[PDB]
Symmetry: D3
Subunit: 102 residues, 6 copies
């Protein structure tokens, strides 16, 4: 399995997280609000966002990336994938994540 992150305006975060679970593209999402500061086209931007921490099988990652890009309101969305130490994690939890990712 892996963890994937994106950030969404709070309008869309929950909607999109819900869809991803309904469509079984991810097993589980944690959402929490966040304050983002970034450089964009020569300016320091400060925004209210929600982070989606998404739990998906390692092979379901490509499909997730595709879907995020379809649904995401930003020209250039964040999609950052983090590697999980699968063998140090709880075996039955990874198996669960794999099972719910169709």
């Amino acid at each position: 399995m892996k963890i994937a992150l994106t950030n969404l305006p709070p309008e869309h975060g929950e909607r999109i997280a819900r869809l991803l679970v309904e469509e079984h593209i991810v097993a589980c999402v944690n959402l929490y609000p966040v304050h983002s500061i970034y450089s964009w086209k020569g300016e320091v931007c400060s925004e209210a966002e929600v982070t989606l921490m998404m739990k998906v099988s390692t092979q379901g990652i490509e499909r997730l990336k595709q879907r995020i890009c379809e649904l995401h309101p930003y020209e250039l969305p964040e999609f950052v994938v983090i590697e999980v130490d699968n063998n140090a994690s709880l075996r039955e939890y990874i198996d669960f994540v794999k099972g719910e990712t169709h």
Copy 2:
């Protein structure tokens, strides 16, 4: 060192995080609330949870996993381990984490 994640109902999060530090199974825990959406036995579940981001030596991970499973109220708890780039991290901070993990 590594980072480990679990999610707990807010009732147990703080209690369990406190124990793990008192028993020196982890060096440090960050707790923050989270909204979780996941698939479970054919249903979309939506819950209030607290994420525990736990900082532990690389070899203390097995013991942490065992302890989490003993204390965790869920049939199938989340326990996800994330690999840390140890050499790009601050050396003295990893040494601290190692030292507090007995």
Copy 3:
């Protein structure tokens, strides 16, 4: 690219996050509050902190570590670097992070 974490008292979190983006040492920071429990010099410490989740090019990490250490109010600050699965992430987002990291 990589993700880097530190935790700061809420007094300094925002200030420091802002500087790092203005100085183009990181592309983007997400800040969120956190409750931290850790062992320090024989005692269980409980504090209000803010987590800075920082997005930086893989080679800009050394400079970030140096800067964090210059600005951070703690004797021993947290600086934890997490490896990103660059090829499973969105290519154009990594390119963006690289571009904003001077």
Copy 4:
């Protein structure tokens, strides 16, 4: 002006807040996530919710109540009006809140 409070599931909180601002039923809304513990039909319930702290003109309250009852997903919604000390508050802020409310 007055402050009104409601709690919504995260899936509806942001959507509904947005609408109330756009329709000029409230001047401003502050949303923040919350863990709700409540008694309901003989069960202790524990939910992820988002609080909407709404700023509205005194004369706009009944419309807000009406609209909240229309849009709210719950059978029995929360609508709680908090008493503002209008003389002690800042005049220009109250005026702003009056001017954005219809």
Copy 5:
């Protein structure tokens, strides 16, 4: 009804809230984490706390105050009652709050 506020250390906030709901001393509690900055014995204090926003019937307030003073870990606890506009609030919500309070 009225709203009552207190702040607790995270280790006690969730436990205490749960009790007050179970004992039917409050109908509902919303908890959310908070950073507290306060003056105490000549020191500026900075703490992680969790706010409990409690819904109780008017006649239930003194019991709530009494129970808060019994359970609260602090020498001098916070107990602040906020004035609800009962006529402008939703009747059925107030009634619900009355019915869950003893």
Copy 6:
């Protein structure tokens, strides 16, 4: 005592709160992040802000208002005073709030 509310950009919320406590203009401040949706000059605005829930003595309110207007970065700042039921609240807490306010 009374409760006063304002909202600030995250870059100023913590700094300003700290000052008001140090100068003994408020006894205590609770800060928490918030997503603000508000109407402003014909635009629906969506911002990251931090709420300051401030505890002050009744006679200290005007100074607090004055100081908030001085320090606040916004042209038109939020300053909203919430009505506390002083008899129903805990006497010793009110007294503490009076004693820390000048």
